Coordinates of C-alpha atoms in Angstrom, one line a residue:
Chain A
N1 CA 226.5 143.2 190.1
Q2 CA 225.0 146.3 188.5
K3 CA 222.3 144.2 186.8
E4 CA 223.6 144.9 183.3
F5 CA 222.9 142.6 180.5
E6 CA 224.0 144.3 177.3
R7 CA 227.1 146.3 178.8
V8 CA 228.5 143.0 180.2
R9 CA 228.4 141.5 176.7
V10 CA 230.0 144.7 175.3
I11 CA 232.9 144.2 177.9
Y12 CA 233.1 140.5 177.3
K13 CA 233.3 140.9 173.5
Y14 CA 235.5 143.8 173.7
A15 CA 237.8 141.9 175.8
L16 CA 238.0 138.5 174.0
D17 CA 239.0 139.9 170.7
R18 CA 242.7 140.6 171.4
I19 CA 243.3 139.3 175.1
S20 CA 243.3 135.5 174.0
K21 CA 246.4 135.8 172.1
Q22 CA 249.3 134.6 174.3
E23 CA 245.9 131.7 176.4
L24 CA 242.1 131.2 176.8
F25 CA 241.5 129.5 180.2
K26 CA 240.3 132.6 181.8
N27 CA 238.2 133.2 178.6
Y28 CA 236.5 129.8 179.2
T29 CA 236.1 130.8 182.9
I30 CA 234.6 134.1 181.9
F31 CA 232.4 132.1 179.4
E32 CA 231.1 130.0 182.2
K33 CA 230.4 133.1 184.3
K34 CA 228.5 134.6 181.5
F35 CA 226.5 131.4 181.3
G36 CA 226.0 131.7 185.1
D37 CA 224.9 135.4 184.6
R38 CA 222.6 134.4 181.9
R39 CA 221.0 131.6 184.2
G40 CA 220.3 133.8 187.4
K41 CA 218.4 129.8 174.5
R42 CA 221.3 131.4 176.3
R43 CA 223.7 128.4 176.1
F44 CA 225.8 129.9 173.2
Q45 CA 229.0 130.4 175.1
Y46 CA 228.5 126.8 176.5
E47 CA 229.5 125.7 173.0
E48 CA 232.1 128.3 172.4
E49 CA 233.8 127.6 175.6
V50 CA 233.9 123.8 175.0
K51 CA 234.9 124.1 171.4
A52 CA 237.8 126.4 172.2
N53 CA 238.9 124.0 175.0
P54 CA 238.7 121.2 172.6
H55 CA 240.9 122.9 170.0
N56 CA 243.0 124.1 172.9
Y57 CA 243.8 120.5 173.7
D58 CA 247.3 120.4 172.3
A59 CA 248.1 117.8 169.5
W60 CA 251.3 115.9 170.6
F61 CA 252.2 113.1 168.5
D62 CA 249.8 111.6 166.0
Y63 CA 247.3 109.4 167.7
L64 CA 246.9 111.8 170.6
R65 CA 245.9 114.6 168.1
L66 CA 243.7 112.0 166.2
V67 CA 242.0 111.0 169.5
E68 CA 241.2 114.6 170.2
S69 CA 239.7 114.9 166.7
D70 CA 237.3 112.2 167.6
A71 CA 236.3 114.2 170.7
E72 CA 235.8 117.7 169.1
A73 CA 234.1 116.2 165.9
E74 CA 231.5 114.4 168.0
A75 CA 231.2 117.9 169.9
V76 CA 230.8 119.7 166.7
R77 CA 228.3 117.0 165.3
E78 CA 225.8 117.1 168.1
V79 CA 225.9 120.9 168.3
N80 CA 231.4 125.0 157.8
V81 CA 230.2 121.4 158.4
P82 CA 232.2 120.2 155.5
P83 CA 235.5 122.0 156.4
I84 CA 235.3 120.5 159.9
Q85 CA 235.0 117.1 158.3
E86 CA 237.9 117.9 156.0
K87 CA 240.0 119.1 158.9
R88 CA 239.0 116.0 160.7
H89 CA 240.0 113.8 157.7
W90 CA 243.5 115.3 157.6
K91 CA 244.0 114.8 161.3
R92 CA 243.2 111.1 161.2
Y93 CA 245.3 110.5 158.2
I94 CA 248.2 112.6 159.5
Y95 CA 248.7 110.0 162.2
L96 CA 252.2 108.9 163.4
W97 CA 251.0 105.4 164.5
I98 CA 249.3 104.8 161.1
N99 CA 247.5 101.7 162.0
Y100 CA 244.6 102.4 164.3
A101 CA 243.3 105.6 162.5
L102 CA 241.9 103.2 159.7
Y103 CA 239.4 101.8 162.3
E104 CA 238.8 105.2 163.9
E105 CA 238.2 107.5 160.9
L106 CA 236.1 104.9 159.0
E107 CA 233.6 105.2 161.7
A108 CA 233.8 109.0 161.8
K109 CA 234.0 109.3 158.1
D110 CA 230.9 107.0 157.5
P111 CA 229.0 109.1 160.0
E112 CA 229.9 112.4 158.4
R113 CA 229.1 111.0 154.9
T114 CA 225.6 109.8 156.1
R115 CA 224.8 113.1 157.9
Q116 CA 224.2 111.7 147.5
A117 CA 223.8 108.0 148.5
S118 CA 225.5 106.8 145.2
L119 CA 228.5 109.1 145.5
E120 CA 229.1 108.3 149.2
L121 CA 229.1 104.7 148.7
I122 CA 231.5 104.7 145.7
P123 CA 234.0 106.7 147.8
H124 CA 233.8 104.2 150.9
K125 CA 233.9 101.1 148.8
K126 CA 237.1 102.4 146.9
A127 CA 237.6 92.2 144.6
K128 CA 235.9 89.5 142.3
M129 CA 233.8 88.0 144.9
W130 CA 232.8 91.5 146.2
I131 CA 231.3 92.5 142.8
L132 CA 229.3 89.1 142.9
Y133 CA 228.0 90.0 146.3
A134 CA 226.9 93.5 145.1
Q135 CA 225.0 92.3 141.9
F136 CA 222.8 89.9 144.2
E137 CA 221.8 92.4 146.9
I138 CA 222.1 96.0 145.7
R139 CA 219.0 96.7 143.5
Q140 CA 217.0 93.8 144.8
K141 CA 216.9 94.7 148.4
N142 CA 215.5 98.1 147.6
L143 CA 216.0 99.1 151.2
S144 CA 217.4 102.1 153.2
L145 CA 218.4 99.8 156.0
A146 CA 220.4 96.4 155.5
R147 CA 220.8 95.5 151.6
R148 CA 222.3 98.8 150.9
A149 CA 222.9 99.1 154.6
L150 CA 225.4 96.1 154.6
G151 CA 226.2 96.3 150.9
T152 CA 229.3 98.3 151.7
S153 CA 230.1 97.7 155.4
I154 CA 229.9 93.9 154.9
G155 CA 232.3 94.1 152.0
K156 CA 234.5 96.4 154.0
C157 CA 234.4 94.0 157.1
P158 CA 235.8 90.9 155.2
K159 CA 238.8 92.8 154.1
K160 CA 234.1 89.0 158.2
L161 CA 235.0 85.5 159.1
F162 CA 231.3 84.7 158.8
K163 CA 231.1 86.2 155.2
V164 CA 230.2 82.9 153.4
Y165 CA 227.5 82.3 156.0
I166 CA 226.2 85.9 156.0
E167 CA 226.3 86.0 152.1
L168 CA 224.4 82.8 151.8
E169 CA 221.7 84.2 154.3
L170 CA 221.5 87.3 152.3
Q171 CA 220.9 85.5 149.1
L172 CA 218.1 83.3 150.7
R173 CA 216.2 86.3 152.1
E174 CA 216.7 88.2 148.7
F175 CA 215.7 85.3 146.4
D176 CA 212.6 84.2 148.5
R177 CA 211.1 87.8 148.4
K178 CA 214.1 80.2 146.4
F179 CA 216.5 77.7 144.7
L180 CA 218.5 80.3 142.8
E181 CA 220.1 82.1 145.8
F182 CA 220.3 78.9 147.9
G183 CA 222.4 77.2 145.3
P184 CA 224.7 80.1 145.1
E185 CA 225.4 79.6 148.9
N186 CA 225.6 75.9 148.4
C187 CA 228.2 76.3 145.6
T188 CA 230.2 78.8 147.7
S189 CA 230.0 76.5 150.8
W190 CA 232.4 74.0 149.1
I191 CA 234.9 76.7 148.5
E192 CA 233.2 71.6 156.8
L193 CA 231.8 74.9 155.5
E194 CA 229.6 73.2 152.9
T195 CA 227.8 71.1 155.6
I196 CA 226.5 74.5 157.1
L197 CA 224.8 75.6 153.8
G198 CA 223.6 71.9 153.3
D199 CA 221.9 71.7 156.7
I200 CA 220.3 75.2 156.1
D201 CA 219.0 74.6 152.6
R202 CA 217.5 71.1 153.7
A203 CA 215.6 72.7 156.6
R204 CA 213.7 74.9 154.1
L205 CA 213.0 65.2 151.1
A206 CA 215.2 66.8 148.5
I207 CA 217.3 69.0 150.7
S208 CA 218.0 66.1 153.1
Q209 CA 219.0 64.0 150.2
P210 CA 221.5 66.7 149.0
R211 CA 222.8 66.9 152.6
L212 CA 223.5 63.3 152.5
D213 CA 225.1 63.0 149.0
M214 CA 227.5 66.0 149.6
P215 CA 228.7 64.5 153.0
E216 CA 229.3 61.2 151.4
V217 CA 231.3 62.7 148.5
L218 CA 233.3 64.9 150.7
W219 CA 234.2 62.1 153.2
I220 CA 233.8 63.3 163.6
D221 CA 231.3 66.2 164.0
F222 CA 230.4 66.6 160.4
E223 CA 229.2 63.0 159.9
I224 CA 227.4 63.1 163.2
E225 CA 225.2 65.9 161.9
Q226 CA 224.5 64.1 158.5
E227 CA 223.9 60.7 160.5
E228 CA 221.5 62.2 162.9
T229 CA 219.6 64.1 160.2
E230 CA 219.0 60.9 158.1
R231 CA 218.1 59.0 161.2
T232 CA 215.6 61.5 162.7
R233 CA 213.8 61.8 159.4
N234 CA 212.8 58.0 159.3
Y235 CA 218.3 52.8 161.0
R236 CA 220.2 51.0 158.1
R237 CA 221.9 54.1 156.7
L238 CA 222.7 55.3 160.3
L239 CA 224.9 52.1 160.8
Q240 CA 226.4 52.6 157.4
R241 CA 227.6 56.3 158.2
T242 CA 228.9 54.9 161.6
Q243 CA 231.1 52.3 160.0
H244 CA 232.6 55.0 157.5
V245 CA 233.2 57.6 160.0
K246 CA 233.6 56.3 163.7
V247 CA 236.5 54.1 162.8
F248 CA 234.7 60.4 171.4
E249 CA 234.5 58.3 168.1
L250 CA 234.4 55.0 170.0
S251 CA 231.8 56.5 172.5
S252 CA 229.8 57.9 169.4
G253 CA 229.5 54.4 167.8
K254 CA 228.0 53.0 171.1
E255 CA 225.5 56.0 171.2
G256 CA 224.5 55.2 167.6
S257 CA 223.8 51.5 168.5
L258 CA 221.6 52.6 171.3
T259 CA 219.3 54.8 169.2
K260 CA 219.3 53.0 165.9
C261 CA 219.1 49.5 167.3
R262 CA 216.9 50.4 170.2
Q263 CA 213.4 49.2 169.1
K264 CA 221.6 42.1 168.0
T265 CA 222.7 45.0 170.2
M266 CA 224.3 43.0 173.1
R267 CA 226.2 40.5 171.0
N268 CA 227.8 42.9 168.5
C269 CA 228.1 45.7 171.1
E270 CA 230.0 43.5 173.6
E271 CA 232.1 42.1 170.7
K272 CA 233.0 45.7 169.8
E273 CA 233.8 46.5 173.4
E274 CA 236.1 43.6 173.9
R275 CA 238.0 44.3 170.5
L276 CA 238.5 47.9 171.6
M277 CA 239.8 46.7 175.0
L278 CA 242.3 44.5 173.2
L279 CA 243.3 47.2 170.9
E280 CA 243.8 49.6 173.8
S281 CA 242.6 48.2 183.1
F282 CA 240.8 50.2 180.3
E283 CA 237.4 48.2 180.5
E284 CA 235.2 50.9 182.0
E285 CA 233.1 51.2 178.9
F286 CA 232.2 47.5 178.7
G287 CA 230.7 47.4 182.3
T288 CA 229.0 50.8 181.5
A289 CA 227.5 50.0 178.2
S290 CA 226.3 46.6 179.6
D291 CA 224.7 48.4 182.6
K292 CA 222.8 50.8 180.4
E293 CA 221.7 47.9 178.0
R294 CA 220.2 46.0 180.8
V295 CA 218.5 49.0 182.5
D296 CA 217.2 50.2 179.0
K297 CA 215.4 46.7 178.3
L298 CA 211.7 46.8 178.7
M299 CA 210.2 45.4 181.9
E300 CA 210.8 49.8 187.9
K301 CA 211.9 46.7 189.7
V302 CA 212.2 43.9 186.9
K303 CA 213.8 46.6 184.7
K304 CA 216.2 47.7 187.3
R305 CA 217.0 44.2 188.4
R306 CA 217.7 43.3 184.8
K307 CA 219.9 46.3 184.5
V308 CA 221.9 45.1 187.6
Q309 CA 222.4 41.6 186.0
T310 CA 223.6 43.0 182.7
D311 CA 226.0 45.4 184.5
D312 CA 227.3 42.8 186.9
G313 CA 227.9 40.3 183.9
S314 CA 230.2 42.9 182.2
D315 CA 232.0 43.6 185.6
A316 CA 232.5 39.9 186.3
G317 CA 233.7 39.2 182.6
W318 CA 235.8 42.4 182.8
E319 CA 237.4 41.5 186.2
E320 CA 238.3 38.1 185.0
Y321 CA 240.1 39.4 181.8
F322 CA 243.7 40.5 181.9
Chain B
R1 CA 205.3 135.0 189.5
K2 CA 207.2 138.3 189.5
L3 CA 206.0 138.6 193.1
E4 CA 207.9 135.6 193.8
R5 CA 210.9 136.5 191.9
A6 CA 211.3 139.6 193.9
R7 CA 212.4 137.1 196.6
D8 CA 215.1 135.8 194.2
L9 CA 216.3 139.3 193.7
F10 CA 216.4 140.0 197.5
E11 CA 216.5 138.7 201.1
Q12 CA 218.6 135.6 200.6
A13 CA 219.4 133.5 203.7
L14 CA 218.9 129.8 203.4
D15 CA 218.9 127.1 200.6
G16 CA 215.7 125.5 201.6
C17 CA 214.1 128.7 200.4
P18 CA 215.8 128.2 197.1
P19 CA 214.6 124.7 196.6
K20 CA 211.3 125.7 197.6
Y21 CA 211.2 128.6 195.0
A22 CA 212.5 126.3 192.2
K23 CA 209.8 123.9 193.1
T24 CA 207.3 126.8 192.6
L25 CA 208.4 127.3 189.1
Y26 CA 208.5 123.6 188.5
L27 CA 204.9 123.4 189.6
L28 CA 204.3 126.1 186.9
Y29 CA 206.6 123.9 184.8
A30 CA 208.9 126.7 183.8
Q31 CA 211.5 123.9 183.6
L32 CA 214.6 125.7 182.2
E33 CA 214.0 128.9 184.3
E34 CA 214.0 126.7 187.2
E35 CA 217.4 125.2 186.4
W36 CA 218.6 128.8 186.1
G37 CA 217.8 129.2 189.8
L38 CA 220.2 126.4 190.7
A39 CA 222.8 128.2 188.7
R40 CA 222.2 131.4 190.8
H41 CA 222.4 129.4 194.1
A42 CA 225.5 127.5 193.5
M43 CA 227.5 130.7 192.6
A44 CA 226.9 131.7 196.2
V45 CA 227.3 128.9 198.8
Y46 CA 230.5 127.0 197.6
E47 CA 231.5 123.3 197.9
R48 CA 229.6 122.6 200.9
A49 CA 225.9 123.9 200.9
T50 CA 226.2 123.7 197.1
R51 CA 226.3 120.0 197.1
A52 CA 222.9 120.1 199.1
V53 CA 221.7 122.1 196.2
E54 CA 223.5 120.1 193.5
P55 CA 222.4 116.5 194.1
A56 CA 218.8 117.3 193.6
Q57 CA 219.6 119.7 190.8
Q58 CA 221.6 116.9 188.9
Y59 CA 218.7 114.3 189.6
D60 CA 216.2 116.7 188.0
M61 CA 217.9 118.2 185.1
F62 CA 219.1 114.7 184.0
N63 CA 215.5 113.7 184.4
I64 CA 214.4 116.6 182.1
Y65 CA 216.3 116.5 178.8
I66 CA 217.6 113.1 179.5
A67 CA 220.5 116.5 175.4
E68 CA 223.7 115.0 176.6
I69 CA 226.3 117.7 176.1
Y70 CA 224.7 120.4 178.2
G71 CA 224.1 118.4 181.3
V72 CA 227.5 116.7 180.8
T73 CA 229.0 120.1 181.0
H74 CA 227.0 120.8 183.9
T75 CA 228.5 118.0 185.8
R76 CA 231.9 119.1 184.6
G77 CA 231.4 122.5 186.2
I78 CA 230.0 120.7 189.1
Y79 CA 233.0 118.5 189.7
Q80 CA 235.2 121.2 191.0
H81 CA 232.1 113.0 196.1
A82 CA 229.5 110.3 195.7
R83 CA 227.6 112.6 193.5
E84 CA 230.2 112.2 190.9
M85 CA 229.8 108.5 191.1
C86 CA 226.1 108.5 190.6
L87 CA 226.4 111.0 187.9
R88 CA 229.0 109.1 186.2
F89 CA 226.9 106.0 186.4
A90 CA 224.2 107.8 184.7
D91 CA 226.3 109.1 181.9
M92 CA 227.8 105.9 180.9
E93 CA 224.4 104.3 180.1
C94 CA 222.5 107.3 179.0
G95 CA 232.7 107.3 176.7
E96 CA 232.7 104.7 179.3
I97 CA 236.5 104.2 180.1
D98 CA 236.5 108.0 180.4
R99 CA 234.0 107.6 183.2
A100 CA 236.2 105.0 184.9
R101 CA 239.0 107.4 184.6
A102 CA 236.9 110.0 186.3
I103 CA 236.1 107.6 189.3
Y104 CA 239.8 106.9 189.2
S105 CA 240.4 110.7 189.4
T106 CA 238.8 104.5 198.5
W107 CA 238.8 100.8 198.4
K108 CA 235.2 100.7 197.4
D109 CA 235.7 103.2 194.7
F110 CA 238.4 100.9 193.3
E111 CA 236.2 98.0 193.6
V112 CA 233.4 99.8 191.6
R113 CA 235.6 100.9 188.7
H114 CA 236.9 97.4 188.4
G115 CA 233.3 96.2 188.2
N116 CA 232.2 98.6 185.5
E117 CA 235.4 97.8 183.5
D118 CA 234.6 94.1 183.7
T119 CA 231.2 95.1 182.3
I120 CA 233.0 96.4 179.3
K121 CA 234.8 93.1 179.0
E122 CA 237.5 91.1 181.0
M123 CA 240.7 92.4 179.7
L124 CA 240.8 95.8 181.4
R125 CA 240.2 94.4 184.8
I126 CA 243.6 92.7 185.2
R127 CA 244.9 96.0 184.0
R128 CA 242.9 97.8 186.6
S129 CA 244.6 96.1 189.4
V130 CA 248.0 97.4 188.5
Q131 CA 246.5 100.9 189.0
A132 CA 244.9 99.4 192.1
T133 CA 248.1 98.5 194.0
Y134 CA 249.2 102.1 194.0
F135 CA 243.9 97.0 204.2
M136 CA 244.4 97.6 200.4
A137 CA 246.7 94.6 200.0
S138 CA 243.7 92.5 200.9
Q139 CA 242.0 93.9 197.9
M140 CA 245.4 93.7 196.0
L141 CA 245.9 90.2 197.3
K142 CA 242.4 89.3 196.0
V143 CA 243.2 90.8 192.6
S144 CA 246.6 88.8 192.5
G145 CA 244.7 85.8 193.1
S146 CA 242.3 86.6 190.4
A147 CA 245.2 87.9 188.4
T148 CA 247.6 85.1 189.5
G149 CA 245.0 82.6 188.4
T150 CA 244.3 84.3 185.1
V151 CA 247.7 84.1 183.5
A152 CA 251.5 87.8 178.2
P153 CA 251.2 84.6 180.3
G154 CA 254.9 84.7 181.4
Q155 CA 254.6 88.4 182.4
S156 CA 251.5 87.2 184.5
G157 CA 253.3 84.3 186.1
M158 CA 256.3 86.6 187.0
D159 CA 253.7 89.1 188.1
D160 CA 252.3 86.3 190.4
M161 CA 255.7 86.2 191.9
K162 CA 255.8 90.1 192.2
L163 CA 252.6 90.1 193.9
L164 CA 253.2 87.1 196.1
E165 CA 256.4 88.9 197.1
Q166 CA 254.5 92.2 197.2
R167 CA 253.4 91.5 200.7
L168 CA 248.6 85.3 206.6
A169 CA 248.6 81.5 206.3
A170 CA 245.9 81.5 203.5
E171 CA 248.4 83.6 201.5
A172 CA 251.0 81.0 202.3
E173 CA 248.5 78.5 200.7
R174 CA 248.3 80.8 197.9
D175 CA 251.9 81.0 197.1
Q176 CA 252.2 77.3 197.8
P177 CA 249.5 76.8 195.3
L178 CA 251.5 78.9 192.7
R179 CA 254.5 76.8 193.4
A180 CA 252.4 73.5 193.1
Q181 CA 250.9 74.7 189.8
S182 CA 254.2 74.2 188.1
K183 CA 254.8 70.8 186.4
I184 CA 257.7 69.9 188.7
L185 CA 259.3 73.3 188.7
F186 CA 257.2 75.3 191.3
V187 CA 258.9 73.2 194.2
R188 CA 261.9 75.4 194.9
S189 CA 259.9 78.7 194.7
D190 CA 257.2 77.0 196.6
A191 CA 259.5 76.0 199.5
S192 CA 260.9 79.5 199.4
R193 CA 257.3 80.7 199.5
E194 CA 256.3 78.8 202.6
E195 CA 259.8 79.8 204.0
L196 CA 258.8 83.5 203.5
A197 CA 255.4 82.8 205.0
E198 CA 257.3 81.2 208.0
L199 CA 259.3 84.3 208.2
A200 CA 256.1 86.3 208.4
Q201 CA 255.1 83.9 211.3
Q202 CA 258.4 84.9 212.8
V203 CA 257.7 88.6 212.5
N204 CA 254.3 87.9 213.8
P205 CA 255.3 86.0 216.9
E206 CA 258.0 88.5 217.6
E207 CA 255.4 91.2 217.9
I208 CA 254.2 91.9 221.5

């Protein structure tokens, strides 16, 4: 109230050297008051009141004190930088739960380390496939972000579920900047999973042929991808794949005959339908496949009337069959 | 400028004057000095007029630095009602659960938190309702339907019983639905449910 600046700081510093030993809630209140007096550059006690209150938060148990270690470390980070990181490392490791601090610290630890590159990476990384993953995208990427910025986390993440898929995409990007890296992904696909690497390598002819041979050798969704790829490329091998797979699967064989034999679909189709009915009231696919075969026929009015004749023929033959 | 600050030193009477003066320095773009003025106002007028200062002071200072810790602290000092919610809504998108705890620290407020928690993903929201229970039963009833439908699953079904029993013909349809849901096992409990709702019809009819 006497408009003193320096004398108030003398009083405040002469007070808070002994009086906080009980403890410091009124110290933080007087810090906020001194930040108020400075208001009416000068946000020094803003940090000191927050940091004292952060440490003042009692550590009870292991995860509670380690949760507080995440709070005050972020407060210290934004505002002995090594000793605060070391005291943070001992707080996370000294945890009673001993299960969640592995995922909590790793984050904090990595950040601290980042905030020189060769030593930090060796500490975090500290097994046969991991060394094989490193030799393909450590020196080759030559990049601050991604090859070395997923050369350690990616390995750490797996032990991800999409590791064989991500590692195959990493080699395809590194080799192209290629049939050397794509074959390494194709070889690791066999060790369902191999069909993913087969469909990707062919998308970049020879790849398509490889995608077929592989599938064949291996052995309902997997064969549908290989059958649709060999059919779209430009009807003989589409029917061959249907015979060695379809035997959803019955509905797939009907959909295959619609596209492959679109341009003896009625005879064979109906025969199959009846056979399925006999091999198990359940004749809803014979009237439905016949109504679509009639409507799909080229002729409108004549095309729609022909679809009604084909659909009604299956219904009449189905209704008169026990 | 000093000629103006002489006013800050003396003859204080109304806030309008305060916001006006801070707007002067803002026009001169002293920025941080201006924020100081809002510091000097609020030490005076206490939790009433101070809010009238503080809502504009927040909207502005957040607009300036956009540094987190300082303004965060400023809301912290500030907090000692809707202003907290706007402010919290700001902080989360410029810890989230922490904010939800703050809003938690009324039905509409409960509804919001639940929304933001759903934004952080589904799992919390079922959790939120348990906090929610302690007209509210309608909100609670809705949560139970949402929660009763959702299900841990045994604890959830038993919770459906605890909620249906927690406290209306549509609700009878709800308990009857919960009974019907069982593969020939929710009958007895279902008939008991319709019986309880009938008892509610009795207590309702008994009312004058």
